[PDB]
Amino acid sequence: SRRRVVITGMGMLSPLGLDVPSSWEGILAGRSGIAPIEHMDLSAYSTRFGGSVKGFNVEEYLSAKEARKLDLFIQYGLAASFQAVRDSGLEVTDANRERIGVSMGSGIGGLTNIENNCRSLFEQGPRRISPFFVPGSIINMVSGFLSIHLGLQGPNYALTTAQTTGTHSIGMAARNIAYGEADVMVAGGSEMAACGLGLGGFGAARALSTRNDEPTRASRPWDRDRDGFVLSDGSGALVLEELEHARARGARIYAELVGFGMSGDAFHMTAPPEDGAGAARCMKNALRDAGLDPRQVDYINAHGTSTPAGDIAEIAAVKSVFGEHAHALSMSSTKSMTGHLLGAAGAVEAIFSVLALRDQVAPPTINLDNPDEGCDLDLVAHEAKPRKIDVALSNSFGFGGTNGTLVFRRFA
């Protein structure tokens, strides 16, 4: 058999706020974190808006000197991680530090740092490149720096599965604990790809909403007028903990992580299949892993990116998995408010899933003014819906047809 895993701490930076409760408050009020991107010339760019972290103060976490060495994505991952560990009340000791690990990932990593060091290289040649360029930019440095700052000697790694990173990070952290390689893991993701290369790179694939006139309306998952996703920055981190370890120290337990599913579509590099066959296999994998019948699922935090093919695949996938229960469950995209945090999306959305369980409320899908063809499910258009939620799914479906599903259950 296998050990049970609970959530005892959460941390977040999002376009809605600099912590979980500020973020969760924006989510339940249907507020948008989307705005024109500042202190950056986007003249030559078809998309000029996104979900920025507003007012981030890294010196609450790090000295100026240590922050100068670290890409914004690492800073964001450290901020959420430190919030999550503080939130958990866990005490690291010589007795337990070998049993505490980290799996904080990113989809794209240090584009901003790569951009500024490129500028240096092209203008002045190699000797102006920072000595901290490599360790200040590579995706495993959130796990590296967190482990060094807190003395964590457990499993130390980083996932990078594009828009699935946060979901896979949390799921595989849960496995480490369940199968006895760790008693505690800090897991989630962080992203800051709102530089030229991010807006440029996604802009050149014409993957992005170009609704520059109304940035807050850009992200409209399942609405007939959606025109691609909104690029957003931030981080989410969860403290995952074995149940007996959490009980022994009197931890506050938000919820239980009961299920993790993975699948590959094996279909296309960036587009999901129209029937969502891959997202369906993955959800079924996640429910089987949790020993749950589809009928027991109450709430789904959808991937719901506001891409035309993505949104419609997820409706197909849900009807396929859930049959006669597909309308009774509530499903919303919090990306309607946050935008797409890419590798961080699954981290912040796992937190919103855990808070849907705590507060017995489905977050809205805002901007769902005119449901598309077949988009007839309970998508919680416009405003939050209080309701019974015992079981909550969080889905992530990313580039390369990589799929993740987390199952959370109320704990008592």
Add this chain to the structure above:
Amino acid sequence: SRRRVVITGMGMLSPLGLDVPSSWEGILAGRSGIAPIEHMDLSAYSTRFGGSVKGFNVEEYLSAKEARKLDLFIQYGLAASFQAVRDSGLEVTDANRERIGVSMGSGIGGLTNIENNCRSLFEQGPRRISPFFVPGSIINMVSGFLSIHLGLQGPNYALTTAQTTGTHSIGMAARNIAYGEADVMVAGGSEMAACGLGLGGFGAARALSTRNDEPTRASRPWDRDRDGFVLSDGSGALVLEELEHARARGARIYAELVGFGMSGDAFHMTAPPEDGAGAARCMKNALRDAGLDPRQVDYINAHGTSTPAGDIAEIAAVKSVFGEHAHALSMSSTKSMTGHLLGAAGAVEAIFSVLALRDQVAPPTINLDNPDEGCDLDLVAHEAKPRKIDVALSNSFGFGGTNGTLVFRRFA
């Protein structure tokens, strides 16, 4: 309940060969694959050589139409993945495609591609960024593209743990199979960091050998005259397979993967501890994971990067784990010949470890002219050593203090 895991297929691009057998012939003959770099102008750089993949034809594997969209690290990962799957004899079918996944990782990923697109952005503006910039550069796309081309619908993911990537990728793919999430995994990693930011960034950190006038003598693990690692390019992939599934199809089994350890130093962003304490914990985790008396270990394929601190920390780690038996086992660094393939280091070296078992030979550490203070173990100086090898261990350490160990033994 935990199932056993065997190697049925291996694939490789290295500075010594465009497959495994050609690479292996170089290893046993003590050949260096390090040379001045030709693919760019390095006169302004303090290091001007590396382990380049020579004569790679991507059209053994892909259309030039698909290949053009992909960074070399992805092309290298696919080439190794395809070799390994072919070498396995496995046929993908409707009956098994859900039970075959992929975990191919990278340390840095598509730095070449991100650089070239950055140069386009800076000189010409955002509209010259390739529409293929994101799917062609991000680390999960070896796993993505391989799943699309072979129809693998199993667990689909990528690790990025700097120089530990290949070892972690292989270990956690083995856990997927061990605990029933999959019957087959294609696991390893790929790296092509030999661009301006790579050589520039590692140069700025003073991490690289500057032995430009004798590049084949640069990589000299445990030698008193070593001055940093040699940057090398390539890929390794193994087909990992549940033992009964391998037996059932009459698969040729190269060796059994019995053991996997992880640990974090929690010491420094880039420097290993002088005493090898984190490496020691990681190897001890792996030996206990395999149910082994440490005296059963015959061969260690060291990380052995040719850094002053790295190499000495490893001797200390091995003496501490193995006590007097440290004097009886054979340890070598094939990085003496291949240089440091970073994220792909653990993948190729896991293959060298398996081939060490098949042929009953310890590969040499070339250039070990004057062993340093305390480097007094059997380091297989100069020349391959035929010897009894039942159990082989492959170590990796990386930035963030992240450690991986793999334990293989002969299968009967």
